Design a binder for this molecule. Sequence first.
Ligand SMILES: *[C@@H]1O[C@H](CO)[C@@H](O[C@@H]2O[C@H](CO)[C@@H](O[C@@H]3O[C@H](CO)[C@@H](O)[C@H](O[C@H]4O[C@H](CO)[C@@H](O)[C@H](O)[C@@H]4O)[C@@H]3O)[C@H](O)[C@H]2NC(C)=O)[C@H](O)[C@H]1NC(C)=O
Ligand SMILES: *[C@@H]1O[C@H](CO)[C@@H](O[C@@H]2O[C@H](CO)[C@@H](O)[C@H](O)[C@H]2NC(C)=O)[C@H](O)[C@H]1NC(C)=O
Ligand SMILES: *[C@@H]1O[C@H](CO)[C@@H](O[C@@H]2O[C@H](CO)[C@@H](O)[C@H](O)[C@H]2NC(C)=O)[C@H](O)[C@H]1NC(C)=O
Ligand SMILES: *[C@@H]1O[C@H](CO)[C@@H](O[C@@H]2O[C@H](CO)[C@@H](O)[C@H](O)[C@H]2NC(C)=O)[C@H](O)[C@H]1NC(C)=O
Ligand SMILES: *[C@@H]1O[C@H](CO)[C@@H](O[C@@H]2O[C@H](CO)[C@@H](O)[C@H](O)[C@H]2NC(C)=O)[C@H](O)[C@H]1NC(C)=O
Ligand SMILES: *[C@@H]1O[C@H](CO)[C@@H](O[C@@H]2O[C@H](CO)[C@@H](O)[C@H](O)[C@H]2NC(C)=O)[C@H](O)[C@H]1NC(C)=O
Ligand SMILES: *[C@@H]1O[C@H](CO)[C@@H](O[C@@H]2O[C@H](CO)[C@@H](O)[C@H](O)[C@H]2NC(C)=O)[C@H](O)[C@H]1NC(C)=O
Ligand SMILES: *[C@@H]1O[C@H](CO)[C@@H](O)[C@H](O)[C@H]1NC(C)=O
Ligand SMILES: *[C@@H]1O[C@H](CO)[C@@H](O)[C@H](O)[C@H]1NC(C)=O
Ligand SMILES: *[C@@H]1O[C@H](CO)[C@@H](O)[C@H](O)[C@H]1NC(C)=O
Lengths: 726, 727, 7, 7
Amino acid sequence: RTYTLTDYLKSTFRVKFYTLQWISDHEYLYKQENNILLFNAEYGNSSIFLENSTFDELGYSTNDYSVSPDRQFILFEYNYVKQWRHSYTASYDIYDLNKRQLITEERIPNNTQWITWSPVGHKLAYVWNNDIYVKNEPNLSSQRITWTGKENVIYNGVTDWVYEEEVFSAYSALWWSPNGTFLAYAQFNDTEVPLIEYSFYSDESLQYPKTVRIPYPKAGAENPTVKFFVVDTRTLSPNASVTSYQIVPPASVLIGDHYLCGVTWVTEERISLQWIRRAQNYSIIDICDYDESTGRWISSVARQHIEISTTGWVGRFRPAEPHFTSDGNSFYKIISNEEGYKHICHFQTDKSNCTFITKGAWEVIGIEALTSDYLYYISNEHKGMPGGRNLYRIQLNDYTKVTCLSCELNPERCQYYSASFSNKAKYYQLRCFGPGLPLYTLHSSSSDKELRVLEDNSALDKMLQDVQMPSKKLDVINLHGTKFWYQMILPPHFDKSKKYPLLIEVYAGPCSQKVDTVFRLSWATYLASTENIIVASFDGRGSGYQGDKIMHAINRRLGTFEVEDQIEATRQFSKMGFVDDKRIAIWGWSYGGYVTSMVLGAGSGVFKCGIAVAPVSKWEYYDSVYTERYMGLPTPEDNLDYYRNSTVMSRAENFKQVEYLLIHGTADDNVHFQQSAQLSKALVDAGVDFQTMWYTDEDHGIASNMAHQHIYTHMSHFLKQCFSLP
Amino acid sequence: SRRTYTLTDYLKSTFRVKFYTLQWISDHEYLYKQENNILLFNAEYGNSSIFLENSTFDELGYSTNDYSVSPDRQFILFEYNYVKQWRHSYTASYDIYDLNKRQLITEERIPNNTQWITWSPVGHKLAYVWNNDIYVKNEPNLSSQRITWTGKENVIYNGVTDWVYEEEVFSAYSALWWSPNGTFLAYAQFNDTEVPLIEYSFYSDESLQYPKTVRIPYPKAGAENPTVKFFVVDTRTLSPNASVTSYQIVPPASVLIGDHYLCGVTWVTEERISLQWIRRAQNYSIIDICDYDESTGRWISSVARQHIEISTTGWVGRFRPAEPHFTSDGNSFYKIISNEEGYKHICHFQTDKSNCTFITKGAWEVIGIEALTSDYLYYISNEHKGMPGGRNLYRIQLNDYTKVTCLSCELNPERCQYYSASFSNKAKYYQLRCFGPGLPLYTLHSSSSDKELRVLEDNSALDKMLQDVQMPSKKLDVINLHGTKFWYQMILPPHFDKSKKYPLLIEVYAGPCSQKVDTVFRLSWATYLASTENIIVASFDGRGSGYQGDKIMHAINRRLGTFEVEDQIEATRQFSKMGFVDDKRIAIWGWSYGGYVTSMVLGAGSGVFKCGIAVAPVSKWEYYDSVYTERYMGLPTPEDNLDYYRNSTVMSRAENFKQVEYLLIHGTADDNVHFQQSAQLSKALVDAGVDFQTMWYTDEDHGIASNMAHQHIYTHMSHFLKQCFSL
Amino acid sequence: ILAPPER
Amino acid sequence: ILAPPER
Ligand SMILES: *[C@@H]1O[C@H](CO)[C@@H](O[C@@H]2O[C@H](CO)[C@@H](O[C@@H]3O[C@H](CO)[C@@H](O)[C@H](O[C@H]4O[C@H](CO)[C@@H](O)[C@H](O)[C@@H]4O)[C@@H]3O)[C@H](O)[C@H]2NC(C)=O)[C@H](O)[C@H]1NC(C)=O
Ligand SMILES: *[C@@H]1O[C@H](CO)[C@@H](O[C@@H]2O[C@H](CO)[C@@H](O)[C@H](O)[C@H]2NC(C)=O)[C@H](O)[C@H]1NC(C)=O
Ligand SMILES: *[C@@H]1O[C@H](CO)[C@@H](O[C@@H]2O[C@H](CO)[C@@H](O)[C@H](O)[C@H]2NC(C)=O)[C@H](O)[C@H]1NC(C)=O
Ligand SMILES: *[C@@H]1O[C@H](CO)[C@@H](O[C@@H]2O[C@H](CO)[C@@H](O)[C@H](O)[C@H]2NC(C)=O)[C@H](O)[C@H]1NC(C)=O
Ligand SMILES: *[C@@H]1O[C@H](CO)[C@@H](O[C@@H]2O[C@H](CO)[C@@H](O)[C@H](O)[C@H]2NC(C)=O)[C@H](O)[C@H]1NC(C)=O
Ligand SMILES: *[C@@H]1O[C@H](CO)[C@@H](O[C@@H]2O[C@H](CO)[C@@H](O)[C@H](O)[C@H]2NC(C)=O)[C@H](O)[C@H]1NC(C)=O
Ligand SMILES: *[C@@H]1O[C@H](CO)[C@@H](O[C@@H]2O[C@H](CO)[C@@H](O)[C@H](O)[C@H]2NC(C)=O)[C@H](O)[C@H]1NC(C)=O
Ligand SMILES: *[C@@H]1O[C@H](CO)[C@@H](O)[C@H](O)[C@H]1NC(C)=O
Ligand SMILES: *[C@@H]1O[C@H](CO)[C@@H](O)[C@H](O)[C@H]1NC(C)=O
Ligand SMILES: *[C@@H]1O[C@H](CO)[C@@H](O)[C@H](O)[C@H]1NC(C)=O
């Protein structure tokens, strides 16, 4: 038996995982059949924290839990209502584990947008109807902080659509302080931000359709205005005013339009802010020290650090985060080499220059932990594969004493590794994502032991031996003098003597990685196993983790290089002995959707059919934070020409020579329906025949259980039809 | 004798059907657009004088796409900058042109973005509506005196109609009626304050970065309808510093008792008006004949001049109570109502007496009174040969109901079975438009000699090109069902062999008072699927169809989507017994009501069908406007007929959809059958495991009628059928 | 309610 | 741009 589409849609072959919760530096929390267990890493004993069946009288059921750091109380999140990528409202209660009851006095509002404990204690801080509150005690009331909240206008402490997606990457604009004195927050103003207006039809029980309105800033439009405040939660009584100080960005960024990137807390008297320009090729870090005499968060030109990029933009997406020591007088950051290779650079808090602790022909993916002795980071240096990820450990005293704590544990089963160092970096948990069955291993920083390995996906391995599974081949093709990376889900019992069909699964977005070493039971695993279709992937110009020269190649010309080298990559695959030159397709989603539609309109002839899901049509149709980072401004001064020289509706007459699926959900908050339905309108205006499929009130993911099944079943039918496969 | 009627021949209309449009400025002259100019044709001898020369069109906008001659023939209007609103509504700029002086009017033009305009029936007065407000221009080179001042966008409508009146009640945009001599200016006002708003997005050009959202006061089923007011302005007291004098004629207390609709206005005499109201259920209409009181300026009603029309079996009339035709004096009128046997005939009403006397009777139905004079009455019915699919012109004598003739039956009784006419102002001449079943034949005739006079359009052009091309053949016949005979038609392929099994297509409308089976000439999409694809496309008029009797038509009352859907499944079943039908290759396809039936047919567990395109279907009757859905289905309240509202939804048939194939075509900018209906169909199909296909047509109305999309919808539909017929 | 039946 | 819900 093969790996059927039903095996994928219903996920019968489960991939078990292990999720941690580090409270101290030797204790973490787990969950077992709805039971909250506390593990002591040092030994191997495990004490319970809360038993199953304790869950009752909680609306419907619990979908998250937040033990306060002091482990006195605990939060019970329920009544979950998704919004955007990370936005969600909920209803919360609090459980006093000591008193063994539930607090019923001064309850938490329904429709809470965000909450978080304090770094130490039970100082609860939540946001409700765009407005901040501080409930220092579970049985006490809420001291309101902001009173200016207004839906679609003023956002206090949470993020608006464009911040939550393309800048902060979470609903959270609340940052407490180490010891629980300062609650820093942010105020967003989408007042003059244009509003996109799509329709929503909901259940059958709605005679008239609602119309959703989102403060969405497209390319060249007006953006939200940020203000960064810091509240002294010490002077917080009912009969007293709320003390706060606005740290405005440095004048090298306040000159025009700007964004706020991140808020890092060094010491209790030292906050570290990261402000970037609208062009995202000028970033600055302002470190501001408190002053008990004035009560002001003052900054100086000594604590200001600039980071720009002439080759393109700053960082990978949002710029790189600063990693501050405990002494606070020196931090570590991933900035880009003069050769264009991002590595860890040691910065002094009052010294403008830098000193690189790592460098090479690779790229540091991200810093993970910093101890008075070592420094831990993950990188693709192992075996020189950019598609790999392994944990290292550099020494501050010797920048030549770095050791790979994960490289050669199981270098066949484990080439993709994630981490979770303890509070004081005493114990780290490694995550083997691929290319073998995922392995979840516990580790000790000192003895370098494997202690108690939790998961091995024994359930997966047993079931997968009674099934035929495809193979993954990773290799390199040479384009433009450099060596790019490609990947292929070769079908079971692959024989080069037979000519196979191709599926060019494509993303190739800015700083992308489709060529990885991860275990993924995907749609391709069905297409390769049962229907015997070679599914390939390629990471050419524009991809990341490989070199800024490669990444900042597509800069200010989207729809050109990423598209073009996808055509040459399939042509080189078609010169291989196992590719039906007449049976090759291209299927995409998001940037893979935009590229697929540009590839298909390229008149290359290499491709015959082509599915696209939520595809970008014109770039003047996307949020400015993203589109202006790469494409620039849609004005004649900046890059109007290359904006119009890249719309999919320009490459339409060539669509007459190919088949084309255009899938999209009606209620798309991101890649709006606007793009798909205007690409369609140009296609109809040309005489191009194409099929489509809308998905009712589906988001950008088309992720309702019956719509997800539908989209892969419907795409499978278009694919097998075009491939003349029974 | 080898070319076929290819699809490109339909989408490009390479075979033109010429017409001949004329408008009677008098009782014996008419106008016509001959080779770009306007000739003042004469009906008596045919000699044609030039009215307005061509190339006279310049410096008047980009174009000139309508013309309106002042009744005195002193002035004429130019309608340019056309902008389609809904079905009949549209905005446009207008100019007036001096005919004697042969100049253009410069002082006081007609405002840009006009909504409607009309001359008076006599003279050259000018009433018009601009920004929801009535104006009057008694002379063209003078300024207008604004009449109404309450007009508010999507709230108050003064002189025009909101969406629901334009659609289901009025079938036009205008809510103005000049009196005979132009003394009074009757009009209506519409207050859509509490009417909920359908909201759909509209994307406009590639240029636009943020889609418009269109908002329409659309009263869906069982929701708050608009309010109606009728006024009679006296255009004699219209001075600049004098008040707008007016009276409010109202429905009598029987209709005023609740919600209501103004469904018709008829001017009788300069001092008598005929208003026709109807309740929201629509099984009760009344007429209020109103005389102008000279002392008080009232329009006083009376119980005696009030005639009632009810329907104990459904709705009143066809889609509204039939309009009345008054004698030249006004003491009586002839109106088309239903009798005791359930057949819509002409009844003669004394204006001040209750009972009426029928003047037509039979197992046929009267289509419509076309003209009335003191001696004779002219109407149209499908009595001839007894087939409801035909139309012929009739003349009955007033004093002698016996003497009734047919002006159009045996004229060309093979080429000419579908006839429509437009008489002179005094019925001294008439144009007999012959629509089918052959090539159309527009023939002018005289009231006295009933002769050919002159043939206006014979379409000899089409004949020449169409004898070098193989063309199909309609088979109008009948099949017995429920102890009655219901009609059917099959557009058979050329060179028909009754032994080869042939694939079936079922073009469906099957609406209340519908006609798919007709003797009309129509180069259709099926005309291709038969000539070039060898597919028999049929059509059946079962329970629900009209012009066949109230007993048949009023069979779907308070049960839409039931009898018409099962009757179309039985009728296809009887076609799959004839040896020339590949029962393993039967299809169905529908637009609007068709899309509903098609989908409800595909989801009934028939087994008769295998594929099915549904273009712009209604999926749930609560999703459609109130007037239509309440005329038949009733009210969605649990004390009326909600139970049937809940089992007439296509989404309730989703499980039975995985036995067939399905193509959901719909337009994102449908103001009639909104995208909502197709979209929620998708949702339950998706939520049930039904694999189907879709295709949204961006910025297209309930017709998907823009040139490149009309081509596409039939290019994308042919492929579905072809691949379902393994063709 | 039907299209504009232009067939 | 911006991929579906992770993978
Ligand atoms: C919504 O709900 C109503 C209420 O149930 C429902 O109406 C019912 O529909 C069924 C199916 O059409 C009716 O049952 C049949 O009625 C027809 C005529 O209406 C008869 O022909 C059937 O009798 C036999 O006829 C043949 C014998 O010569 C047989 O070949 C055939 O198989 C039948 O056995 C049978 O009585 C039922 O009468 C109605 N009920 C009412 C009160 O009208 C309606 O169909 C539902 N609508 C939808 C869209 O589902
Ligand atoms: C949050 O959830 C509900 C709101 O419906 C409230 O819980 C109870 O709701 C029922 C309705 O079924 C009411 O009868 C009670 O008044 C509510 N109980 C209590 C103890 O309040 C709940 O109160 C809401 N919490 C808020 C608004 O803070
Ligand atoms: C300032 O004083 C108290 C808080 O310090 C506020 O509320 C009073 O609190 C006492 C006990 O804490 C209660 O018994 C009273 O009922 C509260 N008084 C009122 C008026 O609510 C008090 O309100 C504050 N003063 C003002 C003017 O707001
Ligand atoms: C950082 O980005 C800005 C904005 O994209 C660059 O300035 C623009 O450069 C383009 C180049 O064609 C000009 O057309 C624009 O007029 C410039 N904008 C302004 C406001 O001057 C700037 O050069 C970039 N800096 C670096 C170091 O690359
Ligand atoms: C945008 O326009 C530019 C220039 O017109 C295109 O860039 C050229 O592409 C051709 C082949 O496609 C190359 O031979 C040239 O060397 C390119 N010139 C430059 C300056 O890069 C580009 O392809 C267009 N973008 C599209 C079509 O998406
Ligand atoms: C239009 O209709 C509305 C109700 O259908 C009339 O009544 C007014 O409605 C608005 C909002 O619904 C209220 O604020 C007003 O107070 C209502 N009027 C009164 C007197 O209370 C409204 O008057 C109508 N307008 C016209 C011009 O006919
Ligand atoms: C006119 O139509 C109305 C509404 O459609 C009819 O009233 C309803 O009739 C149905 C069926 O008989 C009942 O189930 C409802 O309870 C009635 N509702 C009301 C409010 O009366 C009415 O019977 C019709 N009039 C005539 C004379 O037949
Ligand atoms: C932003 O909010 C401030 C108050 O915080 C207000 O004065 C202003 O009008 C708002 N709008 C804009 C565009 O700044
Ligand atoms: C009207 O038709 C064309 C121009 O539209 C041209 O022959 C001439 O101007 C006119 N022809 C007549 C009057 O026969
Ligand atoms: C009508 O009344 C207005 C009121 O201001 C006045 O100015 C005007 O002169 C009057 N009309 C005539 C013709 O006098």
